[PDB]
Amino acid sequence: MNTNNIKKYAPQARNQFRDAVIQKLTTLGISADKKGNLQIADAELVGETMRYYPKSTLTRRDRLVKRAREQGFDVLVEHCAYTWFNRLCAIRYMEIHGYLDHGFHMLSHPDNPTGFEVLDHVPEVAEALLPEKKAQLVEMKLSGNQDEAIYRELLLAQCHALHRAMPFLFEAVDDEAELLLPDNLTRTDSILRGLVDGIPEEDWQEVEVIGWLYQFYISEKKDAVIGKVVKSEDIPAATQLFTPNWIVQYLVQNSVGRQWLQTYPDSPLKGKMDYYIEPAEQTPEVQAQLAAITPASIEPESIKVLDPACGSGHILIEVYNVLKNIYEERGYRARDIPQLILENNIFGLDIDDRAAQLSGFALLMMARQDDRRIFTRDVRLNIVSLQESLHLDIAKLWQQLNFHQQNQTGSMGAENTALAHTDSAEYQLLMRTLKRFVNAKTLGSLIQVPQEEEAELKAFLEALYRMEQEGDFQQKAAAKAFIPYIQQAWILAQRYDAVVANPPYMGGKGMNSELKEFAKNNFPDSKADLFAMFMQNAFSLLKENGFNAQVNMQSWMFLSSYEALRNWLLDNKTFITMAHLGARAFGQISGEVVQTTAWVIKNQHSERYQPVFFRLIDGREEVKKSDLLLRKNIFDKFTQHDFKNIPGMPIAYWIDLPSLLSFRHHKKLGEKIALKAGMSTGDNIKFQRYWYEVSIKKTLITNKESNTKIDIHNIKWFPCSSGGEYRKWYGNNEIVVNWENNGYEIRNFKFENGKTRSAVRNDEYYFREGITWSKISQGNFCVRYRPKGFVFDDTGRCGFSNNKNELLYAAGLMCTPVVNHYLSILAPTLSFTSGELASVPYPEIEDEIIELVTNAIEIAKNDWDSQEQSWDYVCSPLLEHNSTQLLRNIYKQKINTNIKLVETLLLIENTINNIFIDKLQLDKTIIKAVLQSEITLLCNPNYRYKNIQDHTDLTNKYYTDITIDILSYIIGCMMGRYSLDREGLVYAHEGNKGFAELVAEDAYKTFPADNDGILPLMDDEWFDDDVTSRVKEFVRTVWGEEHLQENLEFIAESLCLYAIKPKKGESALDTIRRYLSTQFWKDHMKMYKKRPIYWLFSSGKEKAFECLVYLHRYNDATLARMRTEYVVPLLARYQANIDRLNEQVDGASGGEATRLKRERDSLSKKFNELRSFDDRLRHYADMRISIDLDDGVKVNYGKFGDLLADVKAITGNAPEII
Ligand SMILES: C[S@@+](CC[C@H](N)C(=O)[O-])C[C@H]1O[C@@H](n2cnc3c(N)ncnc32)[C@H](O)[C@@H]1O
């Protein structure tokens, strides 16, 4: 069958049917305004008509006004449009299979694509349906022009004809419902055509279509009610799916068919059950147990099955099929089985009056596929939809009932007449029943009813059937009103051999006010979501040896918020079989939003029982099915007693055995170590910084050059562990938080009313030595060491211990694939909090691992401290070897050192993993050894460039970041941030203050530092303090005028590698200059994560003047000096050559004069752009803008409007063009 047709039609069909009811209700007068307030205006009385229509069609009219005032105008239309659609859908299905007694098609015409067969056989069709109006209808057909009048009469006559067998869908007292039937049913634009035209006939063969009609009708109102709280009337929309047939079979066959096969093991139904999971080999003790409960025989018509949420009845249809083959096998006549199944075996509930309308239809269409006279028998269907009790005239009906026959009939009977036999066990049983179904359109089948009231209700019910059949008008009007409630109560008091359902799914963030309190007070173990309450309630609906079988979300197997429930299941019930599906089990939902599992749980507790699991998480819907059938991916080694060894007690069949026997033999991790969540500052943008953004004087960072005692009164910034990226031993020392005055600002940080926004937690553990981890990590789990002088927030959780060895032995553990083996178990998410991480095992201490971890952390710390983004940065790693050697040879010397360390840490990490795996007695096959690509070091090209698979292009890209990093360090020495003479960071505080002292102290005597802190970054050599100029002065001052040219050609060779595009004949010197003016800005953006310490003042898009400015060295007089000594003298040289280039264009010709014009044209564009960058720099230079370094980089960079480059990529806001 092709759903793609129904999926497109049914949503459109819903709304279609709805406007046709509004348009007919507007005539009917029942109407609401835009605000949902109802309007009557009563009804005109033009003699014997009600103009807006007959006046016998008034009373009936005045019962819509009644019901609409009882529910909701929106509701009315949403229901009645559905009922008719369900009716017409029921007719369409039934006319294709020729189920009609008159044997003519009703909605279509076989030999005419546009017509209606009931129109040409008016005499025959009328003879069957309306024998009295035959002379009239044969007269209107002979008028040939009243077909819409005629067809409106036969079609209404057909639905009436179907009320005898299907009273739940085709009601007969629907009087008002006839006034809402649309006209023009006989036109090419009737609503009817889409129902026929949108669905080919082959889609109608099988019955599942009923469920796809079901699922796509309401699909649209679903997309409007998701994410929000769901109204009591929107529930059927928001929770309505459709189970694949292969899951239902697995559910029905492993519950119903299980019990039958449990008594008659050599039943040929086992071959007829493809999804029947055979029982695993039990211990002799359980083997004695199960035989003691299985009855020696089961009679077929003693089995009773319940779907509490049938929906389309898709599950009942399969129960019907499983029961069908049980009756055949027992020796029962063919025709007699449907009645016995639908009356003695199949019972179903739901809240959507219109979902039952389809479900019962579906069972009757399966029954009509087997017995032609099931439509002649009084077949009571136990498929009912739940009804509220806020609209009953209870005192009016119990006196209309005359159950004990109190009114001797005939005594014409007063507004104070004491309700007689209010003490009768039919009244007290009736009132207790009407009190249980108050908000039935909200609770559904979760309402329990005591089994003790079973007998009294059925005897009351059958009597309510009798008196519906033998009684007078009041007793038949009355006893017809009470049956829906006495029946639905009778279904709830009854217990069943198997409950099969695909329950509804709704987390505790769409439940409405009414529903929530019902969960806290009645289902505390499973108050989180609906599907769980159905799981725990369904057990209250089974016999002792009964089977609960559902297909549920998987979260009840893991989330600690179900621990009380998971604890409850293991103690009282017996898991039988479970097929864990995971995602994409339903081939018609989109997104990884739905993860499921189907299971069967006996209502008896057996300890030593051996259940069978199927891990079918992979593939589309088709695959799990194929692997389920082929019995791929089977687990049958763990009893339900074994799953109690895991903190929280997760259903965790995927576990093996030595990992289960290690939770019991060893001690918990977060027990030993104080897993503490950090503060929550409330605002990470106000309080947290990158350490390079602020003055090093104003940080708790102990510099290698400030022996002056850190005055803890001037200290504003303290290094803060704030989450970050994966890392296995030490990095991420990048965030500093504002902790001045012991956090006076974070502590008093309040909202508007007075409540406190931040959440300073565990501030006793601050500045301690400990570890840390990304609380949130996409990949594996990893921890890093954390020295003293740090704080930490909630994004960077930290464990602490008093023993440094345990602090390392833990840090060595929490980084293995072994830990990521457990964290899969306790909580398969990306959240690595302090609660599941605390339940991790943790064995005795070995002294070997503590050295391997000390070596590993210093390998990792040496790795981290090597970049200029770290505070502990000393100098560029090239400057560790002799300064006579050739530069290309020093590159080679450094790479070989960087591969040995990867192997060492890899051999260390794998030695650590292999030691833990030996102690916990684990399986090295499950825990793979660490690979070189996972060694979390920045010198490992495999890890830094995960995306590049090559070796050459991997090696080249490595040489390339190596050549850029040495350029940003030289640009660093130009500004004054580092120095050859002095180890470590040199100058980094506000206002260019104290820089000059350093110069007088020969802080930069080897390589001089730029005077003003303005470096022109240009593509041709104008100034002498140009960047590309001083770089050569650097290489010359370091490696030798001897080597200058090959070291420079090798730099040219290496920039060209990945950084920029080479050019033939381009000197080493030109090659370098090109990079700096164009690409360096971007790499420095990336290098500092869009937080530049060197600011590129840019004239504009012609790159007429670009200069770098070091952030710390900035003062008021800079933009005045920037204009005095750079922007002013440069606009003078541009002119003395536009004039010299015009002395040559007139003195040249041919190919050279066209070359001097493009050199004069290009030079004049850079003269107008730097003329308006001067008109705009003079603007910002007068302002004497003086910065504050504590403010941040995203703020100051907007203070200059568009003078700087990438103002909208750094600040976010487009540059404010002053
Ligand atoms: C049961 S599943 C759909 C049934 C479908 N035949 C299948 O294969 O699963 C979702 C349906 O459950 C229905 N349902 C039944 N009983 C319910 C209850 N007590 N509360 C809410 N929804 C309920 C909802 O109306 C919704 O349409």
XYZ file of C-alpha atoms in Angstrom, residues 508-886:
379
model
C 5.865 16.042 32.111
C 6.146 19.262 30.082
C 2.942 18.906 28.053
C 0.731 17.453 30.769
C -1.965 19.878 31.879
C -2.855 20.959 35.418
C -5.436 18.219 36.018
C -3.128 15.389 34.955
C -0.029 16.251 37.000
C -1.439 15.969 40.529
C -3.008 12.639 39.549
C 0.544 11.392 38.884
C 2.283 12.665 42.040
C -0.341 11.148 44.353
C -0.941 7.833 42.541
C 2.214 6.965 40.534
C 5.244 8.389 42.372
C 7.679 5.783 41.019
C 6.778 6.720 37.438
C 5.440 10.287 37.520
C 7.741 11.483 34.719
C 5.871 10.391 31.576
C 2.589 8.767 30.550
C 4.024 5.599 28.979
C 5.452 4.655 32.383
C 2.163 5.142 34.233
C 0.612 2.780 31.687
C 3.398 0.288 32.427
C 2.814 0.292 36.189
C -0.983 0.507 35.894
C -1.210 -2.353 33.385
C 0.169 -4.689 36.059
C -2.823 -3.778 38.230
C -4.957 -5.166 35.365
C -3.503 -8.690 35.038
C -4.027 -12.090 36.585
C -1.072 -13.407 38.576
C 0.370 -15.394 35.651
C -0.525 -12.659 33.151
C 1.632 -10.909 30.573
C 2.169 -7.176 30.186
C 3.358 -6.360 26.659
C 3.940 -2.837 25.346
C 6.228 -0.857 23.047
C 7.613 2.084 25.019
C 10.197 4.808 24.988
C 13.533 3.558 26.295
C 14.192 6.252 28.933
C 12.574 4.155 31.686
C 15.548 1.791 31.369
C 18.180 4.402 32.302
C 17.144 7.831 33.625
C 17.670 8.036 37.382
C 14.235 9.691 37.673
C 12.846 6.169 37.091
C 15.083 4.445 39.669
C 12.205 4.036 42.119
C 10.253 2.453 39.255
C 13.109 0.306 37.935
C 13.537 -0.803 41.542
C 9.820 -1.640 41.707
C 9.789 -3.753 38.533
C 12.667 -6.038 39.486
C 11.118 -7.037 42.839
C 7.557 -7.974 41.837
C 7.484 -8.968 38.151
C 9.243 -11.254 35.666
C 10.751 -9.907 32.464
C 10.009 -12.329 29.628
C 11.207 -10.872 26.317
C 12.250 -7.374 25.265
C 13.162 -6.059 21.810
C 15.133 -2.837 22.308
C 14.484 -0.782 19.164
C 16.113 2.595 19.729
C 15.517 5.103 16.944
C 13.842 4.996 13.508
C 11.691 2.027 14.494
C 8.689 3.845 12.978
C 9.268 4.463 9.288
C 7.060 7.578 9.194
C 8.329 9.921 11.914
C 11.125 12.400 11.200
C 14.047 13.185 13.502
C 15.960 11.358 16.235
C 13.118 12.337 18.569
C 11.688 8.832 19.124
C 13.588 5.979 20.828
C 11.546 2.895 21.668
C 11.505 -0.648 23.041
C 8.873 -3.396 23.111
C 8.757 -5.952 25.902
C 6.740 -8.630 27.701
C 6.702 -8.768 31.515
C 4.917 -11.490 33.475
C 2.865 -10.322 36.469
C 4.618 -12.867 38.720
C 8.012 -12.486 40.374
C 10.509 -15.201 39.468
C 14.104 -14.545 40.516
C 16.256 -17.094 38.639
C 14.262 -16.555 35.386
C 16.365 -16.095 32.254
C 14.882 -13.419 29.931
C 15.680 -12.886 26.252
C 16.629 -9.503 24.795
C 17.100 -8.224 21.238
C 19.491 -5.325 20.581
C 17.945 -3.864 17.437
C 19.053 -0.231 17.634
C 20.684 -0.092 14.185
C 19.146 0.490 10.779
C 15.811 1.638 9.428
C 12.466 0.037 10.282
C 13.068 -2.752 7.765
C 16.397 -3.846 9.260
C 15.427 -4.382 12.913
C 12.486 -6.383 11.578
C 14.768 -8.498 9.381
C 17.266 -8.917 12.214
C 14.430 -9.624 14.664
C 13.076 -12.368 12.399
C 16.546 -13.779 11.710
C 17.015 -13.668 15.531
C 20.138 -11.560 15.173
C 21.588 -9.787 18.216
C 20.368 -12.012 21.086
C 21.175 -11.669 24.805
C 20.239 -14.450 27.244
C 22.864 -14.532 30.011
C 21.540 -12.137 32.688
C 18.572 -12.756 34.957
C 16.499 -9.873 36.293
C 18.264 -10.274 39.649
C 21.569 -9.239 38.051
C 20.272 -5.802 36.987
C 20.012 -4.691 40.646
C 23.798 -4.250 40.938
C 23.914 -0.946 39.025
C 23.314 2.369 40.861
C 19.851 3.441 39.802
C 19.239 -0.178 38.650
C 19.103 0.390 34.864
C 17.757 -2.302 32.594
C 21.201 -2.812 31.044
C 21.158 -6.079 29.129
C 23.910 -4.840 26.804
C 26.376 -5.221 29.682
C 28.617 -8.285 29.814
C 29.450 -10.280 32.926
C 32.878 -9.251 34.349
C 31.720 -5.613 34.270
C 28.607 -6.508 36.275
C 30.691 -8.441 38.829
C 32.930 -5.378 39.303
C 30.278 -2.991 40.660
C 29.933 -5.471 43.544
C 33.626 -6.201 44.190
C 34.959 -2.612 44.284
C 34.221 0.899 45.586
C 32.552 3.916 43.977
C 34.586 6.718 42.379
C 32.629 9.862 43.307
C 32.499 8.404 46.787
C 36.302 8.588 47.149
C 36.647 11.908 45.302
C 34.541 14.999 46.062
C 32.763 15.444 42.759
C 31.572 19.026 43.204
C 29.628 21.211 40.830
C 31.062 24.712 40.586
C 29.425 28.095 40.820
C 26.910 29.388 38.325
C 27.906 33.013 37.808
C 24.488 33.727 36.252
C 26.187 35.571 33.379
C 29.358 34.165 31.799
C 29.626 37.208 29.501
C 29.933 39.702 32.378
C 32.270 37.804 34.743
C 34.422 35.427 32.636
C 37.375 36.380 30.423
C 40.212 34.991 28.365
C 43.366 35.624 30.383
C 45.069 37.551 27.566
C 42.224 40.093 27.461
C 43.127 41.650 30.823
C 46.240 43.103 32.439
C 48.565 40.402 33.750
C 49.075 42.646 36.794
C 45.341 42.258 37.563
C 45.390 38.429 37.525
C 46.273 35.807 40.133
C 48.743 34.486 37.569
C 52.224 34.049 39.054
C 54.523 35.402 36.340
C 58.168 34.383 35.875
C 59.155 38.079 35.967
C 57.114 39.601 38.844
C 58.778 38.663 42.147
C 56.911 41.594 43.711
C 54.448 40.140 46.208
C 51.044 39.756 44.562
C 49.003 42.332 46.485
C 45.736 40.421 46.905
C 43.853 43.733 47.184
C 44.509 44.839 43.574
C 43.630 41.376 42.215
C 40.471 41.238 40.092
C 40.852 38.179 37.828
C 41.421 34.596 38.953
C 41.914 31.609 36.615
C 38.608 29.758 36.264
C 38.096 26.229 34.956
C 35.135 26.672 32.569
C 34.535 23.463 30.629
C 36.034 23.454 27.163
C 37.082 20.846 24.631
C 38.167 17.228 25.082
C 41.739 16.999 26.524
C 43.352 14.095 28.342
C 45.679 15.671 30.876
C 46.127 19.463 31.352
C 44.948 22.138 28.872
C 41.996 24.609 28.880
C 43.642 27.048 31.300
C 42.051 29.923 29.422
C 39.117 31.349 31.415
C 39.608 33.822 34.257
C 36.616 34.951 36.305
C 36.020 38.087 38.369
C 36.563 37.073 42.015
C 37.495 40.410 43.575
C 36.558 41.042 47.224
C 35.899 37.299 47.559
C 33.289 37.622 44.809
C 31.323 40.681 45.983
C 29.871 41.086 42.486
C 28.901 37.453 41.858
C 27.414 37.157 45.354
C 25.211 40.294 45.234
C 24.348 39.833 41.524
C 20.535 39.982 41.652
C 17.566 40.223 39.299
C 15.196 43.188 39.382
C 12.951 42.173 42.277
C 15.680 41.066 44.710
C 16.272 37.371 44.063
C 19.893 36.300 43.582
C 20.885 35.191 40.071
C 24.283 33.568 40.603
C 24.833 30.316 42.511
C 28.188 30.201 44.322
C 28.505 26.539 45.319
C 31.328 24.623 46.998
C 33.419 27.788 47.250
C 35.326 26.030 50.034
C 37.064 23.997 47.298
C 38.341 27.067 45.423
C 42.062 27.642 44.778
C 42.637 23.989 45.681
C 44.676 21.532 43.677
C 42.392 19.107 41.905
C 41.172 17.850 38.567
C 38.449 19.014 36.186
C 36.451 17.876 33.182
C 34.145 19.291 30.566
C 30.735 18.794 32.184
C 29.474 18.636 28.591
C 31.411 16.621 26.000
C 30.322 15.242 22.635
C 32.957 12.520 22.457
C 34.467 10.523 25.293
C 35.179 11.443 28.918
C 38.454 13.103 29.869
C 39.831 14.894 32.910
C 42.656 17.373 33.306
C 44.839 18.380 36.218
C 44.074 21.717 37.881
C 46.756 23.440 40.009
C 46.178 25.739 42.972
C 44.926 29.259 42.383
C 41.911 28.249 40.273
C 38.195 28.587 40.767
C 35.498 26.929 38.667
C 31.873 27.316 37.635
C 29.117 24.830 36.760
C 30.371 24.324 33.180
C 33.721 23.068 34.506
C 33.017 20.627 37.316
C 35.948 19.658 39.522
C 36.742 16.700 41.714
C 39.027 17.105 44.696
C 40.891 14.834 47.058
C 43.334 15.302 49.910
C 45.791 12.615 48.758
C 47.645 13.827 45.675
C 48.222 10.201 44.634
C 44.490 9.442 44.594
C 43.977 12.799 42.871
C 46.274 11.468 40.126
C 45.166 7.823 40.332
C 41.687 9.224 39.700
C 42.914 11.546 36.944
C 44.621 8.493 35.467
C 41.411 6.485 35.687
C 38.938 9.139 34.473
C 40.786 9.337 31.135
C 40.883 5.686 30.042
C 38.520 4.027 27.579
C 37.651 2.072 30.732
C 35.784 5.008 32.284
C 34.008 5.731 29.004
C 32.960 2.074 29.173
C 31.051 2.632 32.418
C 29.667 6.091 31.606
C 27.956 4.392 28.664
C 26.076 2.230 31.187
C 24.897 4.541 33.963
C 23.630 7.240 31.544
C 23.954 7.128 27.726
C 23.895 10.897 27.079
C 26.464 13.668 26.633
C 26.044 14.990 30.199
C 28.904 14.017 32.525
C 27.613 15.402 35.818
C 28.507 14.507 39.418
C 25.745 11.911 39.917
C 26.305 9.118 37.420
C 30.060 9.791 37.443
C 29.979 9.167 41.195
C 28.703 5.604 40.741
C 31.821 4.628 38.736
C 33.848 1.721 40.212
C 37.314 2.364 41.643
C 39.754 -0.328 42.911
C 42.924 -0.561 45.013
C 45.870 1.747 44.408
C 48.918 0.626 42.435
C 52.055 2.750 42.517
C 53.031 2.177 38.867
C 50.051 4.092 37.472
C 50.831 7.223 39.499
C 54.176 7.608 37.704
C 52.643 6.931 34.281
C 50.131 9.681 35.075
C 52.761 12.110 36.382
C 54.743 11.565 33.175
C 51.561 11.921 31.108
C 50.420 15.177 32.713
C 53.823 16.815 32.291
C 53.778 15.633 28.667
C 50.350 17.251 28.423
C 51.385 20.356 30.372
C 54.524 20.768 28.258
C 52.175 20.466 25.277
C 49.765 23.162 26.481
C 52.352 25.655 27.797
C 53.911 25.810 24.318
C 51.269 28.054 22.693
C 51.035 31.812 23.160
C 47.387 31.365 24.214
C 48.704 30.015 27.548
C 49.974 32.172 30.387
C 52.863 29.794 31.192
C 54.337 30.532 27.745
C 58.115 31.022 27.791
C 59.288 31.401 24.177
C 59.008 29.923 20.696
C 60.155 26.262 20.615
C 62.474 26.958 17.661
C 64.790 28.875 20.017
C 65.797 25.818 22.079
C 68.476 24.546 19.667
C 71.723 26.082 18.474
C 71.279 29.356 16.558
C 73.838 28.431 13.861
C 71.740 25.644 12.319
C 69.658 25.940 9.147
